[PDB]
Amino acid sequence: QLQLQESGPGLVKPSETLSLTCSVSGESISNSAYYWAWIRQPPGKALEWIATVYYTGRTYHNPSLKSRVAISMDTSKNQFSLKLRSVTAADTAVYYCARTGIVVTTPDWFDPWGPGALVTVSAASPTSPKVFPLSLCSTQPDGNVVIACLVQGFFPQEPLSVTWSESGQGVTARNFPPSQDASGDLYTTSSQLTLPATQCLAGKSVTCHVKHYTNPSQDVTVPCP
């Protein structure tokens, strides 16, 4: 199947140039049938198409970004790339690559897309989260056990993924969007695991896996009640 995959840095310092590469699999970008575009989306804001490249070298550009944008294409690697200059906090966004020119000989709509890569324009360096096991001091609910993981002080807020060693029937994991700390600059969230008390006996423990940014996943032991 046709798949697109963005690659790039998680962080780029202000005023530097952002570089992204889309790796295309299952279709040749040198084919005259399709164009190849970059779209971005700031967190909480609308989609914004950036530029499109064609095998002949023809390029289209968003008028509000043409001056800072360079799009190109590597037919040998079957990749196409985006370069955004003068990045500020306004350029913090998820960046998508997509195929266009589906029905007409010029760009029409985008299908399919890449997964999207977050790019954070910040002078700050990554901060790994400090993960802490949480134990319910409330009343345990109706035959289940509620445990949690505190994921405190990390940056950037994404990509943050929390999974648990237990899953399936009777198990429900709840994750929450990273929240900016009142402390400053860092982010904190939590993950909740509800599972049958049968599956979290005293003395045993469940592991919550916190994978943040490109670092390996932290694995923290969360004791059962």
**3-class state of residue 77 by DSSP:** coil
Name every residue whose Cβ is closer than 8 Å to that of residue 17 and which is 6 or more positions away in sequence.
83, 84, 85, 86, 87
Residue 16 or 23 having the CB closest to other proteins: 23
d(CA 128, CA 151): 10
d(CA 38, CA 82): 7
DSSP state of 30: T
Residue 116 or 126 having the CB closest to other proteins: 116
Q: How far is the CB of 76 from other proteins (least distance, A)?
A: 26
Residue 89 or 136 having the CB closest to other proteins: 136
Q: Are 39 and 49 in contact (CB under 8 A)?
A: yes
Q: How far is the CB of 171 from other proteins (least distance, A)?
A: 14
Q: How far is the CB of 215 from other proteins (least distance, A)?
A: 19
Which parts of this chain interact with other proteins (CB under 8 A)?
Answer: 37, 46-49, 52, 60-63, 96, 98, 100, 102-103, 106-116, 130, 132-138, 141, 146, 148, 150, 152, 174-183, 188-190, 192
Q: How far is the CB of 121 from other proteins (least distance, A)?
A: 20
